[PDB]
Design a protein around this ligand. Sequence first.
Ligand SMILES: [Ag+]
Ligand SMILES: [Ag+]
Lengths: 126, 122
Amino acid sequence: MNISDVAKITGLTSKAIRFYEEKGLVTPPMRSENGYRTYTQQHLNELTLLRQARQVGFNLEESGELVNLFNDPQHSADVKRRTLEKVAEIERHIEELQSMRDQLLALANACPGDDSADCPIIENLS
Amino acid sequence: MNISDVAKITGLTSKAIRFYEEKGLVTPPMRSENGYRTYTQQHLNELTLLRQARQVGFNLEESGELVNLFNDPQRHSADVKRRTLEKVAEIERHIEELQSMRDQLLALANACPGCPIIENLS
Ligand SMILES: [Ag+]
Ligand SMILES: [Ag+]
């Protein structure tokens, strides 16, 4: 498979794919007779893991580490640890959003909601 | 007050304060006789509102409009309320998105001993 095939299959652009290689986040593909990158199923799995990990919350570095763990013959407990930590991270984010949502709704309920200039929302946000 | 003092008081970096000025989202700072930026309580209020609006979820343009409404003696509270309820709906969507992400990670984790997590993500 050439880089265009991988882009189509993974949904990643060829630039993003070259980027992942450039940052050593994935295994470097070998070169064909004419010098073009040749990809294997392993590359597809690494790029998929990278794309999906990101989509579910892991950042670049974290995603790169998951790829590292993936290629390792040997870490169920470890990956679980990383995953549960991601969950805790997301829950704190959910908690913060919920808090801001409730603060806005408390202010909104206090708002005259009319043509008067008096506004608790603006006054308490500034 | 100079920009350093404003940064400490507002909790914004000097970078951010200068950025808001460059974007025309805040009343420009004054220049002292020595040519350097000086600020008043008015600037503090606008920057505070700006900092808090961005934190709660308002983007740049929206935050700038809140600063305008703030400076408008004839502002209509109804307008601020409408904008606020619209932002709340957005936050709700964000929350739901995070909850589904969390649900998926916990599903993977539940299926794992001590790897279903890596096999499915890859
Ligand atoms: Ag109001
Ligand atoms: Ag596992």
